[PDB]
Amino acid sequence: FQSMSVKGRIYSILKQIGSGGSSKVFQVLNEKKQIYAIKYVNLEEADNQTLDSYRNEIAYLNKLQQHSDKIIRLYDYEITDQYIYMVMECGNIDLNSWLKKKKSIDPWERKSYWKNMLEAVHTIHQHGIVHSDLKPANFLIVDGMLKLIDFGIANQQVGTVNYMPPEAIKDISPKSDVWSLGCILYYMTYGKTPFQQIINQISKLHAIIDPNHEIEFPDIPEKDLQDVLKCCLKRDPKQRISIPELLAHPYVQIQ
Numbered sequence: 001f002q003s004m005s006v007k008g009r010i011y012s013i014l015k016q017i018g019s020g021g022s023s024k025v026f027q028v029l030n031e032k033k034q035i036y037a038i039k040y041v042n043l044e045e046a047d048n049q050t051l052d053s054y055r056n057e058i059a060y061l062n063k064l065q066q067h068s069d070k071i072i073r074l075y076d077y078e079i080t081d082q083y084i085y086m087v088m089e090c091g092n093i094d095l096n097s098w099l100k101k102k103k104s105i106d107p108w109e110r111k112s113y114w115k116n117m118l119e120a121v122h123t124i125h126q127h128g129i130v131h132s133d134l135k136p137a138n139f140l141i142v143d144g145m146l147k148l149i150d151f152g153i154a155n156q157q158v159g160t161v162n163y164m165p166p167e168a169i170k171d172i173s174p175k176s177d178v179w180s181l182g183c184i185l186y187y188m189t190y191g192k193t194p195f196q197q198i199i200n201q202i203s204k205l206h207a208i209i210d211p212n213h214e215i216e217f218p219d220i221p222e223k224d225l226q227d228v229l230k231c232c233l234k235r236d237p238k239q240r241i242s243i244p245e246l247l248a249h250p251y252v253q254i255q
């Protein structure tokens, strides 16, 4: 019923999808009755460092459009001193809500999603971006295809420590993203993150960095999937598999 204008084009709001601090995401319809997602950002209480982090992220989203379809489509935007309006493609659901709603995941679906995550994250690395806070909430299902929605640049399932690499707890390398992606895949395999059993956040951080804390990798029919997991979840980033290596791995390549 409500409406909004973005670069002269009018959009009618269908429903609110997301909500950040000063941001809101809405499912909308244009004049041609085409569906889109509009992200609204209130810049009223935003300082210069915040504004520039927002502008840097918008520029990377706009640039990386061309380089990969595993990155969310950004059709247009309007930016003033009071607000940002971002016209994007609308997803069906984020990966976190999908993983929470669905109990068991198909191995084919899992493999397909993993490929998409690698392609998206690989793309940002080729441009010098290390996300450093990947979690299922950063991925959107858009027509049986996972797409990355953000680059971790803009000032921010927020707070979560379950996908955090041991090197990030000690303190900035593409290997940090590999650990996080490994945690997402571990969740899509075992239905839990590697340290989800630890309630206490301090004890949890202690176990992620603890080399004497053996991560369990229960036996599964996909031995190649178990290997990817063991390779991503190597505490020493030097011993950790890289994205180009993950793309050549049997799990992703072999039918």
Ligand SMILES: COc1ccccc1Nc1cc2[nH]c(-c3cnco3)cc2cn1
Pocket: 017, 018, 025, 027, 037, 039, 072, 088, 089, 090, 091, 092, 093, 094, 097, 140, 149, 150
């Ligand atoms: C029906 O739409 C959804 C329902 C539940 C969760 C997600 C979606 N779809 C959606 C959510 C979105 N969030 C962003 C976004 C937030 N920050 C940058 O892009 C784009 C987007 C595009 N489509």
